[PDB]
Design a protein around this nucleic acid. Sequence first.
RNA 1: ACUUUGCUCGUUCCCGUUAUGGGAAAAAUUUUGGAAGGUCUUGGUAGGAACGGGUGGAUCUUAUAAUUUUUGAUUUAU
Length: 50
Amino acid sequence: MNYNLSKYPDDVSRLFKPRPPLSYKRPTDYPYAKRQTNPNITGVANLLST
RNA sequence: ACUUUGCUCGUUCCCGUUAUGGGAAAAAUUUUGGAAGGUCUUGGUAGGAACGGGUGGAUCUUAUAAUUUUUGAUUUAU
């Protein structure tokens, strides 16, 4: 926070001092490329006989 | 159901009589509604009503199931 990209003066921009940076935690879900619903939706015609 | 008729019973009063009948009505009792008064409690005490609009904001319907939120690609799959 050496500099100010905001419209306010320096004293006002020191008031908007943020929290410390967020810690890192390993993910528990699926990575974005591996997301899909169900593929291999099986066919509907097998029902129709039996 | 309405109208007339005598008989039997009946809440209360009177009479013919206390077998029973005739007449009157809640005027005695209760429940329901309202007015007034008493007692106890609980809350308020500076705004309120009526009218009004090229007034703000909520909710609802329709555009709107077509890439930026709600009409399915995060049950890890073959």
